[PDB]
Design a binder for this molecule. Structure first.
Ligand SMILES: CCCCCCCCCCCCCCCCCC(=O)OC[C@H](CO[C@@H]1O[C@H](CO[C@H]2O[C@H](CO)[C@H](O)[C@H](O)[C@H]2O)[C@H](O)[C@H](O)[C@H]1O)OC(=O)CCCCCCCCCCCCCCCCC
Ligand code: CLA
Ligand code: CLA
Ligand code: CLA
Ligand code: CLA
Ligand code: CLA
Ligand code: CLA
Ligand code: HEC
Ligand SMILES: CC1=C(/C=C/C(C)=C/C=C/C(C)=C/C=C/C=C(C)/C=C/C=C(C)/C=C/C2=C(C)CCCC2(C)C)C(C)(C)CCC1
Ligand SMILES: CC1=C(/C=C/C(C)=C/C=C/C(C)=C/C=C/C=C(C)/C=C/C=C(C)/C=C/C2=C(C)CCCC2(C)C)C(C)(C)CCC1
Ligand SMILES: CC1=C(/C=C/C(C)=C/C=C/C(C)=C/C=C/C=C(C)/C=C/C=C(C)/C=C/C2=C(C)CCCC2(C)C)C(C)(C)CCC1
Ligand code: OEY
Ligand SMILES: [Cl-]
Ligand SMILES: [Cl-]
Ligand SMILES: [Fe+2]
Lengths: 442, 36, 34, 137, 334, 82, 341
């Protein structure tokens, strides 16, 4: 009894048609990933930084070690091509299967086969489908391990000499590190799982999650929900969808912070500098310039009485001054050579800054992730000229929006699934209004 | 009375706007008003 | 049996006719170079 | 007002010879300056060293004088400090340093003339705005 | 008859004058903490080095503020996004100087408010209602998250979250316009449309229902006494109201289905305020309003100003002056 | 529910409707187009062309500064272009 | 049954667009105001009055086009096409800003027409005239902002110009010069607009989630009949809910819907009064106690003093370009500026 605008709710109990819808929808996702990569490649110019070019897919591929060499220089675009083509081709197959099951295929599965057919209230069947996909997901995570250890490695922004592609031979297995991250605070200087800053920990966590997902898939194939879970949840398709909505929302919020703060699995070489990074780089830039003119940056008092170039953090570390004091938790490969045990080392600042570090600071400062909707780069008072919005702003903003609506989608479908399950989603029964049988409040 | 199906009139009005509006966005990057 | 020309008829064309004229004017404008 | 050959006539060197660009060259120059230079020099300032702008009066007091096509073309090959006392190709884009500034790899000699031409024209059009900063936006 | 089952039964009781519920078990303490700390800080808190530059701003009534100027001031820029609970300070003296109460108040409040939204789902379930009033409240909730949490996360500091005070609010707006050109952002424009239209349709609907009240009273009594709580008969004539509105505009621009009308009322401001919360939340990552600065130039290349450039002149005056002692380098990157 | 005018759904799906309007709608669009492309719109309304905001060596607004001589003032500026 | 009653008959016939006697005033004025604005933003410059481009023809987009106000030199001239300024020359009329007064005045009489239309239709249909009454708030706002405010000032030049960005500039002007956010009459306007939007959303949501089950389908919209006598949602359950969530709830549907009229209408009336004061520069600019202390005590800083520095920046940085008739020349050294920026 749904209206056209709620028309896909007509599929709830048509498993063969609902299968075609998912598989056709999976084809669109594969299609876009293929089309968009090729579109990016056709536009790519290798002499420009990726992040002056509106690229978000090519950086995800470079980061896996394909096509790049030392310092993120693109050496070979053919891998990019291959990824686009293969996705694009594969979408026709998913497309084919989706429209077949959606139009011609059996409308319902449970008569054609007892294996593929399902009933949402069959808690056992449901947890078996769950277990199958968990095993898939665990295999997925191990592919990333396989790449990193056996098939060429991964791009490492922290490698010596500019960063470079590196095979990971000692992935971190120590659970105290791996789950250590999951118990770090999400606040500044800690940053929960977003602070992961080396490929050993990245690959080791994927070994773990791969094992955990396979273990859990086998667990869920072999078992049925215990009574306490039986009585805690709503067991319906719309309830299950609302659970996944909640989870995707949470993941979207996390990915937003990952791309905004993390410069390890989003190398700044490809994505542009982070906000903190660019801000730190501005202080570095003027520290350098002023010191070449003879300024003693260690002993320069700023207008506030705090140091103009260098000051202390609240726990004592020597950090960049000005408003960037907020960003002193920033860590990046162009800066760390200057850190000593107490923070920035004044003797290395006076003696050991290298031209490449001058270059990289000047470059990141002039590529801060600020820009207008119409891609005028920089603060909102800048004149037109520079056509630039960071990949990072594009990826962070889009995913905050998506993550938000999915939380709204979670609330919508969770509340409805509860009400439908108890039988009052279509409204209040006039002849049995619960408030009219309750005593008055006063 | 009903000789033209309404959905077709709707589809073709539809692209009619998409074209005029897309021209107007193209024009934001060409010529007057493009900053160039 | 309906009438063609009505008050409604006039209200509509009093808006629709200048609209298309302005749209053509505004379309031409996109090809003006400085 | 319009983009006349008077405004498109800029000095070629210090000897006083001059050269008239075309509107094609100017727009080519503006495009290439945007591609290669505006990230630091938008509107004729220098975001990473505001004390040195691209005003013609400033280029003229540079050593080698830089207020002419030749001086600008040489600067893009072998940039020096304002007193000319040191070469700075390792921290400033140039053809000498196109290994480390990859946007300079595909610039031809004629691209340089246009970039240089745009820099010398633009203050004739904008006035104080070129190199003046936000005060003049 | 078990002790826990009896507790569960009071928690979830529909007879409590105010509904507690499981979300209420978190909401009650967190909002109490935030309320009590707010009231005391607003009255007596000493000045706070909001911008980390050892330049304390006085926010409370006893330090020379009035109701309009007072505020609980954001925590120091020197803290950035670090967690600063009381037990992380050497003393309350230090916590107060560095803005500790702002953090205490907003974290408890965002929690309690989030639980406020859950509580609306929960009671709706206990009373046999449909469930989506909480979805309407997610619009203001999202907006508070944006100015108290999201925007500081993207800018790297709670010192740039919104102050808890009337004038502090205006300071946040002016600084925001200078750095994000928020007026020229479509998501703010939609928020204005959701909020102007919200007020519009509030007045419209209130006037249309009020216009078609059925005569039930004399002129010496409030017409309001023509309605008795819980009467089954509607108290106005929707066909008369549609007959007026459809003629004021034209027939098909008027609702005669009360359900579609009231759903319209819910949707328009909710959706507009989602967008404007999303606008704040996306300008938190510096994807700013449209920039048409110097977009029109003449045949020679002279700049021809538009109203957008004038806006920019205003924006620059806001830029150059804000936090006038806090910037040592020429770009305010965050 | 109806006031006697012919329903729109019935008109815009009618063949006679589209017979007339497949001429009138393009005719109007072309006319609008030509108002601009011929330059007539500039002249009717007084709008400067890209070449005529300023005289060549000039960056002063020709701002109207008198109330009753304002008409003559604008013409004084327009003649400072010819 | 002479001509006048025959004409009344025709004006009041039930047709797709009711005309009425009010239509004679409303329809020409509304249409000319609408047409003047579309004409001006498509084709007409603001070069001679403001030194701005402002039409599609000139390279502007939907956000930057405007029908701008006349030059400050026009004072409050009515700028009649046949008046002494334009002297019947259409082209000069356009270049001097005549289209602005054209739109303002015709809009004003169109607004009158519309409110008379609400009166007329309500008398014919037999309902009470509360929608007309509510519309007094938009009228008050419009005359106070577009007519009274510039009439207290030096010229129409300082009225709002009809344009998206031009109105944005009007907002910022009022902050920098009038400190309008500090004005309790505006604050009451804010609480009325935001209070209305809240009432709007909370009332629609409530009804939609206390619906009675009156049909069998998942679309609850089909289960309403406009001639049914029964209320379509439970006021009793709605009241319980809000009583237990918020502590208090509406219990009287008549009060509730009158309250929805009251809140936004009152809020707008209040902001209009504030704007009448600003006509005279009667601002809520300062708190004297705050300034006495701050001048004497240079460690004393509030959000109040911080916002006035911002106002001072706005004034100095926008005045020369926004008020070109004043020929303000502010050398670099006099512009107020924090460190570095
Ligand atoms: C089950 C129900 C859930 C209930 C959970 C209840 C407890 C949750 C507590 C949440 C508090 C989140 C505040 C995060 C603040 C912040 O600093 O968060 C950002 C942190 C990242 O922290 C940053 O992490 C950084 C990590 O980078 C470091 O390491 C990097 C390595 O590459 C680089 O080197 C970088 O330079 C270096 O600094 C630094 O440590 C920074 O100092 C640190 O601020 O992200 C995070 O941990 C990622 C996750 C944050 C999610 C935030 C989203 C919340 C908003 C959703 C609201 C929806 C509203 C709905 C209303 C309707
Ligand atoms: C990803 C988007 C998506 C997907 C996959 C689906 C899928 C589906 N919908 Mg939903 N729907 C959607 C969006 C989507 N919908 C939207 C946006 C709306 C709002 C308008 C609706 C409204 C809606 C309604 C109202 C109903 C559905 C129904 C259905 C199902 C039956 C379709 C049918 O009988 O069509 C028949 C249509 C055709 C035969 C026309 C041609 C369609 C084909 C598939 C186009 C494919 C084109 C492609 C280029 C071909 C390449 C093939 C190549 C690879 C070989 C189907 C599984 C129906 C349902 O639930 O049935 C119980 C139903 O009643 N949908
Ligand atoms: C979902 C994530 C996502 C992200 C972050 C981006 C981000 C980007 N894309 Mg990509 N793109 C996407 C999805 C995404 N796209 C999809 C789904 C398509 C298919 C339509 C494309 C097709 C596409 C093309 C064809 C191009 C880009 C380009 C770009 C860049 C400039 C975008 C811009 O100026 O938009 C301006 C902003 C908008 C149009 C705002 C959209 C507002 C929406 C309608 C509100 C909706 C709210 C709800 C969801 C930027 C790097 C350009 C580029 O630089 O390529 C190299 C380019 O030419 N994209
Ligand atoms: C997850 C998605 C999904 C699911 C659950 C189903 C499920 C089903 N399909 Mg559909 N189908 C799918 C995708 C899917 N299919 C795709 C992608 C296509 C296009 C190729 C089709 C085309 C299709 C047709 C043409 C027909 C079905 C039919 C059926 C039924 C029986 C199939 C059978 O006996 O398997 C046989 C088992 C095998 C062939 C197992 C061998 C291993 C598989 C095929 C390879 C797996 C590789 C890997 C996991 C994925 C690809 C790698 C890639 C990442 C590069 C069953 C209900 C039939 C039906 O309903 O008849 C009435 C039928 O006629 N399907
Ligand atoms: C897609 C993933 C997925 C999904 C949907 C499920 C779903 C389910 N699992 Mg399975 N499970 C999975 C993966 C998954 N599982 C994996 C990978 C494993 C292997 C480790 C298991 C191991 C497992 C066991 C051992 C059991 C289940 C059980 C269940 C059922 C009850 C779950 C429950 O009450 O959670 C609700 C969870 C809680 C009430 C506890 C929350 C504890 C977390 C860590 C608190 C932290 C919250 C914090 C805000 C989030 C940040 C994380 C933090 C650590 C940093 C349900 C069907 C139960 C069942 O009935 O099985 C038959 C059961 O006993 N699962
Ligand atoms: C995994 C994602 C997912 C899935 C599978 C569903 C599935 C479903 N939803 Mg939920 N939903 C989701 C996410 C999801 N939802 C999110 C994120 C939200 C919050 C936004 C909602 C909010 C929501 C509501 C409010 C309702 C549903 C309903 C439903 C059912 C019918 C929906 C339908 O027919 O759509 C039909 C599709 C349309 C009408 C098309 C909508 C078009 C969108 C709004 C425009 C977006 C344009 C985009 C930004 C790009 C702009 C570019 C331009 C060129 C177009 C179906 C069970 C209905 C329900 O309860 O039924 C049980 C219902 O009333 N959904
Ligand atoms: C009801 C419709 C209506 C209303 C109220 C207005 C109102 C107005 N118009 Mg608009 N106008 C209208 C329709 C309307 N107009 C139409 C239909 C057109 C298109 C043709 C225009 C075109 C238009 C232009 C082009 C201009 C106006 C202007 C004005 C303003 C000045 C009018 C004035 O001075 O009148 C003076 C005249 C009267 C008040 C008429 C009074 C008649 C009395 C009662 C009888 C007098 C007897 C007579 C003189 C005897 C004749 C003698 C003979 C035998 C020798 C005013 C706001 C001006 C404006 O906006 O300023 C910028 C302007 O320039 N109007
Ligand atoms: C695109 C190829 C260009 C061109 C044509 C120029 N630059 Fe730069 N520039 C930068 C810095 C920090 C300085 C000061 C150098 C110093 O003296 O230490 C300069 C200087 C110049 C000049 C000289 C100006 C003068 O008044 O003498 C010129 C003519 C010049 N540049 C031209 C910084 C940058 C960049 C930062 C990454 C980038 C990119 C460019 N410049 C690019 C270009
Ligand atoms: C059911 C349904 C639906 C859905 C649908 C879908 C969603 C579908 C999908 C499907 C798909 C998803 C599709 C895909 C396709 C694809 C294709 C068909 C492919 C092709 C390819 C090609 C051909 C390629 C080629 C190439 C190469 C190889 C190289 C490079 C170049 C090129 C590119 C050329 C709808 C809603 C509509 C409606 C209702 C029903
Ligand atoms: C990969 C990687 C890694 C790792 C990771 C990991 C290992 C993960 C983990 C994760 C996990 C481990 C997670 C978990 C989560 C959980 C959750 C999320 C839960 C939740 C729950 C809930 C949701 C509940 C609810 C409820 C309640 C509370 C009551 C009753 C009812 C219910 C059930 C509803 C690292 C970082 C090292 C590095 C990089 C990469
Ligand atoms: C002033 C004047 C006058 C008058 C005039 C007029 C009356 C005018 C008219 C005019 C007009 C009457 C105009 C029109 C135009 C229109 C237009 C220009 C339109 C636009 C459109 C659009 C662009 C849209 C689009 C869209 C979108 C975007 C989305 C949705 C869909 C649509 C389609 C809606 C006279 C002569 C008396 C004299 C005096 C002066
Ligand atoms: O706008 Mn301007 O940018 Ca965001 O930081 Mn840099 O200055 Mn300061 O502390 Mn509050 O405020
Ligand atoms: Cl400030
Ligand atoms: Cl700084
Ligand atoms: Fe109502």
């Amino acid at each position: 009894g749904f209206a056209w605008w709620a028309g896909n709710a007509r599929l709830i109990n048509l498993s063969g048609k609902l299968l075609g819808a998912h598989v056709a929808h999976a084809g669109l996702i594969v299609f876009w990933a293929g089309a968009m990569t090729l579109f990016e490649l056709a536009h790519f110019i290798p002499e420009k930084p990726m992040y002056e070019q509106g690229l978000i897919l090519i950086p995800h591929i470079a980061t896996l070690g394909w096509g790049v060499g030392p310092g993120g220089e693109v050496v070979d675009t053919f891998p990019f091509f291959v990824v686009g083509v293969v996705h694009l081709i594969s979408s026709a197959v998913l497309g084919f299967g989706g429209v077949y099951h959606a139009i011609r295929g059996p409308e319902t599965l449970e008569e054609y086969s007892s294996f593929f057919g399902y009933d949402w209230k069959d808690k056992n069947k449901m947890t078996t489908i769950l277990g199958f996909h968990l095993i898939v997901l665990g295999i997925g995570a191990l592919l990333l391990v396989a790449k990193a250890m056996f098939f060429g490695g991964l791009y490492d922004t922290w490698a010596p000499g500019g960063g470079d592609v590196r095979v990971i031979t000692n992935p971190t297995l120590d659970p105290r590190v791996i789950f250590g991250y999951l118990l770090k605070s999400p606040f500044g200087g800690e940053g929960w799982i977003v602070s992961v800053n080396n490929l050993e920990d990245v690959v080791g966590g994927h070994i773990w999650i791969g094992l955990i997902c396979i273990a859990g898939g086998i667990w869920h194939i072999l078992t049925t929900p215990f009574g306490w879970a039986r009585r805690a949840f709503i067991w319906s398709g719309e309830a299950y969808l609302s659970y996944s909505l909640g989870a995707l929302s949470m993941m979207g919020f996390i990915a937003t912070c990952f791309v905004w703060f993390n410069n390890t699995v989003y190398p700044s070489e490809f994505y542009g500098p982070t906000g903190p990074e660019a801000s730190q780089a501005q202080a570095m830039t003027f520290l350098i310039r002023d010191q070449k003119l003879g300024a003693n940056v260690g002993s320069a008092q700023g207008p506030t009485g705090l140091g103009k170039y260098l000051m202390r953090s609240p726990t004592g570390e020597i950090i960049f001054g000005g408003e960037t004091m907020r960003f002193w938790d920033f860590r990046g490969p162009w800066l760390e050579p200057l850190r000593g045990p107490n923070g920035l080392d004044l003797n290395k600042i006076k003696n050991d800054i290298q031209p490449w570090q001058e270059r990289r600071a000047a470059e990141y400062m002039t590529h801060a992730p600020l820009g207008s909707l119409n891609s005028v780069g920089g603060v909102a008072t800048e004149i037109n000229s520079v056509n630039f919005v960071s990949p990072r702003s594009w990826l962070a903003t889009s995913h905050f929006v998506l993550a938000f609506f999915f939380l709204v989608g979670h609330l919508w479908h969770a509340g409805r699934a509860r009400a439908a399950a108890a039988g009052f989603e279509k409204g209040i029964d006039r002849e049995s209004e619960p408030v009219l049988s309750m005593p008055s409040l006063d | 009375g009903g000789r033209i199906p309404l959905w077709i009139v709707a589809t073709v009005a539809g692209m009619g706007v998409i074209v005029i509006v897309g021209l107007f966005f193209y024009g934001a990057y060409a010529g007057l008003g493009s900053s160039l | 049996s309906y009438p063609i020309f009505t008050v409604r008829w006039v209200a509509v064309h009093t808006l629709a006719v200048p609209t298309i004229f302005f749209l053509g004017a505004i379309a031409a404008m996109q090809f003006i170079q400085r | 007002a319009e983009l006349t050959p008077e405004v498109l006539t800029v000095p070629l060197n210090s000897e006083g010879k001059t050269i008239t660009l075309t509107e094609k060259q100017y727009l080519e120059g503006k495009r290439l300056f945007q591609y290669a230079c505006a990230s630091c020099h938008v509107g004729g300032i220098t975001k990473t060293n505001p004390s040195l702008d691209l005003r013609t009066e400033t280029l003229a007091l540079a050593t080698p004088p830089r207020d002419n096509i030749e001086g600008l073309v040489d600067y893009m090959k072998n940039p020096t400090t304002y007193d000319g006392e040191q070469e700075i190709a390792e921290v400033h884009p140039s053809l000498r340093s196109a290994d480390i500034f990859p946007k300079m790899r595909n610039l031809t000699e004629k691209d340089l003339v246009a970039i240089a031409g745009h820099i010398l024209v633009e203050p004739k059009i904008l006035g104080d705005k070129w190199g003046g900063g936000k005060v003049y936006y | 008859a078990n002790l826990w089952e009896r507790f569960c039964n009071w928690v979830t009781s529909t007879d409590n004058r105010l509904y507690v519920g499981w979300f209420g078990v978190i909401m009650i303490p967190t909002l109490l903490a935030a309320t009590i700390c707010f009231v005391i800080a607003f009255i007596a808190a000493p000045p706070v080095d909001i911008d980390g530059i050892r330049e304390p701003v006085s926010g409370s009534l006893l330090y020379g503020n009035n109701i309009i100027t007072g505020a609980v001031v954001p925590s120091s820029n020197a803290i950035g996004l670090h967690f600063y609970p009381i037990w992380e300070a050497a003393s309350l003296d230090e916590w107060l100087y560095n803005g500790g109460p702002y953090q205490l108040i907003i974290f408890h409040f965002l929690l309690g408010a989030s639980c406020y939204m859950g509580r609306q789902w929960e009671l709706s379930y206990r009373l046999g209602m449909r469930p989506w009033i909480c979805v309407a409240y997610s619009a203001p909730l999202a907006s508070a998250f944006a100015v108290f949490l999201i925007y500081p996360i993207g800018q790297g500091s709670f010192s740039d979250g919104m102050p808890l005070g009337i004038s502090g609010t205006f300071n946040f707006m002016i600084v925001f316009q200078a750095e994000h050109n928020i007026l020229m952002h479509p998501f703010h424009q939609l928020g204005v449309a959701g909020v102007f239209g919200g007020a519009l349709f509030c007045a419209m609907h209130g006037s249309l229902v009020t216009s078609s009240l059925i005569r039930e009273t004399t002129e010496t009594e409030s017409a309001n006494y023509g309605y008795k709580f819980g009467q089954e008969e509607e108290t106005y004539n929707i066909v008369a109201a549609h007959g007026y509105f459809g003629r004021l505009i034209f027939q098909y621009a008027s609702f005669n289905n009360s359900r579609s009308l009231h759903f319209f009322l819910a949707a328009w401001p909710v959706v507009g305020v989602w967008f404007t919360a999303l606008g704040i939340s996306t300008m938190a990552f510096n994807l700013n309003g449209f920039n048409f600065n110097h977009s029109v130039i003449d045949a020679k290349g002279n700049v021809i100003n538009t109203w957008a450039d004038i806006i920019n002149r205003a924006n620059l005056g806001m830029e150059v002056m804000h936090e006038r002692n806090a910037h040592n380098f020429p770009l305010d990157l965050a | 529910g109806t006031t006697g005018e012919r329903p729109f759904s019935d008109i815009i799906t009618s063949v006679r409707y589209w017979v007339i309007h497949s001429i009138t709608i393009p005719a109007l669009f072309i006319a609008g187009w030509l108002f601009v492309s011929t330059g007539l719109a500039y002249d009717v309304f007084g709008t400067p062309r890209p070449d005529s905001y300023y005289a060549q060596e000039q960056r002063s607004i020709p701002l109207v500064t008198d109330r009753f001589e304002a008409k003559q003032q604008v013409e004084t500026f327009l003649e400072q272009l010819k | 049954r002479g001509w006048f009653d025959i004409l009344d008959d025709w004006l009041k016939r039930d047709r797709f667009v009711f005309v009425g006697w009010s239509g004679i005033l409303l329809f020409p004025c509304a249409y000319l105001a609408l047409g003047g604005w579309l004409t001006g933003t498509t084709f007409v410059t603001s070069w001679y009055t403001h030194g701005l481009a402002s039409s599609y023809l000139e390279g502007c987009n939907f956000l930057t086009v405007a029908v701008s106000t006349p030059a400050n030199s026009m004072g409050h001239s009515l700028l009649l096409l046949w008046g002494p300024e334009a002297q019947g020359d259409f082209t000069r009329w356009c270049q001097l800003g005549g289209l602005w007064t054209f739109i303002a005045l015709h809009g004003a009489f169109g607004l009158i027409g519309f409110m008379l239309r609400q009166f007329e239709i309500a008398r014919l249909v037999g309902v009470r005239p509360y929608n007309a009454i509510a519309f007094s708030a938009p009228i008050a706002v419009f005359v106070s902002v577009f007519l009274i405010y510039p009439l207290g000032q030096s010229s129409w030049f300082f009225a709002p110009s009809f344009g998206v960005a031009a109105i944005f500039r009007f907002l910022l002007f009022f902050q920098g010069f009038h400190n309008w956010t500090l004005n309790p009459f505006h604050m009451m306007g804010v609480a009325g607009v935001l209070g209305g939007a809240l009432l709007c959303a909370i009332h629609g949501a409530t009804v939609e989630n206390t619906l009675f089950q009156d049909g069998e389908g998942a679309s609850t919209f089909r289960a309403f009949n406009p001639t049914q006598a029964e209320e379509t949602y439970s006021m009793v359950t709605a009241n319980r809910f809000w009583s237990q969530i918020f502590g208090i709830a509406f219990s009287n549907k008549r009060w509730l819907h009158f309250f929805m009229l009251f809140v936004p209408v009152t809020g707008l009336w209040m902001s209009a009064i504030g704007v009448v004061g600003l006509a005279l520069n009667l601002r809520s600019y300062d708190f004297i106690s705050q300034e006495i202390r701050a001048a004497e005590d240079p460690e004393f800083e509030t959000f109040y003093t911080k916002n006035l520095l911002l106002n001072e920046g706005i004034r100095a940085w926008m005045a020369p370009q926004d008020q070109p008739h004043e020929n303000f020349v502010f050398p670099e050294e006099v512009l107020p500026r924090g460190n570095a920026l």
